[PDB]
Amino acid sequence: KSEGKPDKLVVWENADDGVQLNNTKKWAGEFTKKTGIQVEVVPVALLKQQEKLTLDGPAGKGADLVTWPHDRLGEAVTKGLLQPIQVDNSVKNQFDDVAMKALTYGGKLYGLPKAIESVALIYNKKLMGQVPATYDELFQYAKANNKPDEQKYGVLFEANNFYYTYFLFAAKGAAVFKEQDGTLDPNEIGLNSPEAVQGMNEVQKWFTEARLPQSLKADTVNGLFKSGKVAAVINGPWAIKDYQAAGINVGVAPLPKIDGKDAQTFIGVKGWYLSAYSKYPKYATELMQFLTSKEALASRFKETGEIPPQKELLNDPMIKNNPVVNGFAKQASKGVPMPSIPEMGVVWEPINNAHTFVAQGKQTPEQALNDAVKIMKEKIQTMKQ
Ligand SMILES: OC[C@H]1O[C@H](O[C@H]2[C@H](O)[C@@H](O)[C@@H](O)O[C@@H]2CO)[C@H](O)[C@@H](O)[C@@H]1O
């Protein structure tokens, strides 16, 4: 035996969400009960953990287990904040294959998943019955029913935001970065390809034909849906509690089939990661498994409402027979992980600006995308190491 038994392990969990924190406190508590190892759960906001570990880790005051959305994994790995976990393939196979890809980087695994999210078709049950079967039917519904003058819409979403419009680009075969055997090439950006132009042509139609507000934001979409005058939006699970609090009877379905295939959305995965500064990688990895078991994640789902990308649980009635969860899970099963390489960080601004220029009719799809990609490629070589 080499790794000595730790007196304590430290876990950082979301500070802003009470139920997420208390669920982790529960299962950390059960681990302590089982093993006699103290597990301290410290409240730290998800998007503050990476910065805090950069300071506290080297100081010897860092957590053993940390958590944040997977899209910033690349930054963490390259800067040496995290170390790989060593678990058998049987452990990986407890979880959704695509969710596990999100937590893999440079041919190494960095964590086990807690939650998966994707946009889907969220609809007002008083306004929509059977959801459109195809994208063509959905767009026709928008053209027929969108009335900006009366603040009433058939379909309304953040069509000027690439996170939301990704499915339109993916439908045409467009990629952000060229993928080769798990590795993304930051130098081969696909966002000004002919495929990408076809995607942006669809985006343009939402403003030229479906009459969407040309400077819309998240609050425009959410406010109007909560007003009871919007039949359907394209949005994620993060908006559900707000919609229900407003009195909307909410339905959720996968996005209608587009260009003959399932719609492909981005998925975001929140996992547990292992600090590179942990003195107890083996014991901490045992804790990580304990926190992500079938039992632990069933409990986590019921408390937090966040879909656990755990194979058995995804097939459980707790997911499949829940009217505000099932649709998200179905859509998530057809999605792809948001790129996690550091270079993705500087893609959002230029690509979203390109959406704005197209929406406002200031530039053609081709012109806007060409400009956006030029901007990206300059930003990639700028401050990045
Ligand atoms: O506007 C681009 C934006 O996209 C993503 O943000 C998502 C977020 O991940 C979801 O949790 C949800 O809130 O919808 C957001 C859409 O704005 C990226 O995570 C973000 O970095 C990027 O700026």
Structural summary, described in words:
- It is a lipid-anchor.
- With 385 residues, the protein is an alpha+beta fold.
- It folds into two domains: 1-118 and 266-339, Periplasmic binding protein-like II (D-Maltodextrin-Binding Protein, domain 2); 119-265 and 340-385, D-Maltodextrin-Binding Protein, domain 2 (3-Layer(aba) Sandwich).
- Helix content is 42%, strand content 19%.
- It has 17 helices and 15 strands.
- It has helices at 18-35, 49-59, 73-78, 89-92, 97-102, 135-145, 162-171, 194-208, 218-226, 240-245, 281-291, 294-304, 311-314, 317-320, 326-332, 348-359, 365-382; strands at 8-13, 38-43, 65-69, 82-83, 104-105, 108-109, 111-117, 120-124, 153-157, 177-180, 183-189, 230-235, 250-253, 266-275, 336-337.
- β5 and β6 form a beta hairpin.
- The chain is globular.
- A molecule of 2 linked components (GLC-GLC) is lined by residues 71, 161, 163, 236, 238, 268, 348, 352.
Can you tell me the number of structural domains? Answer: 2
Rg, nearest Å: 22 Å
- DSSP summary, beta strand count: 15
Helical amount among residues, as a percent range?
40-55%
Notable features of this structure?
SBP; D-Maltodextrin-Binding Protein, domain 2; four-stranded mixed β-sheet; 385 residues; globular; alpha+beta; carbohydrate transmembrane transporter activity; five-stranded mixed β-sheet; binds a molecule of 2 linked components (GLC-GLC)
